[PDB]
Structure 1
């Protein structure tokens, strides 16, 4: 603690991801709903909005 700022121990954590090029496992708090057919709609399958 006698050392000034910039010398204190700092805990650092890094998070890695890949984006949409593989079957996703971790998803957000979003809620699903039933699909539709033969209708002009917009969809959010796993992220591909």
Structure 2
């Protein structure tokens, strides 16, 4: 318990500004006027884009 340790703390803030940091993911094209499930910067759902 008395030996030294090393600490690294990572702090995240949620999406309020445009996203800058995130992992690898390929992006497809935009499809509209069709029921489809989407993913915009990490938020999921299902609907129609217009």
Normalised TM-score (structure 1): 0.74
Structure (1 or 2) with the larger CA radius of gyration: 1
More strand by percentage: 2
Q: CA RMSD in A?
A: 1.0
How many residues get paired? Answer: 43
Alignment gaps of 5+ in structure 2: 44-50
- Segments ≥4 residues shifted beyond 4 Å: none
Alignment gaps of 5+ in structure 1: 1-5
Taking CA–CA contacts closer than 8 Å with sequence separation of 6 or more, which of the two structures ends up with the larger relative contact order? 1
Normalised TM-score (structure 2): 0.73
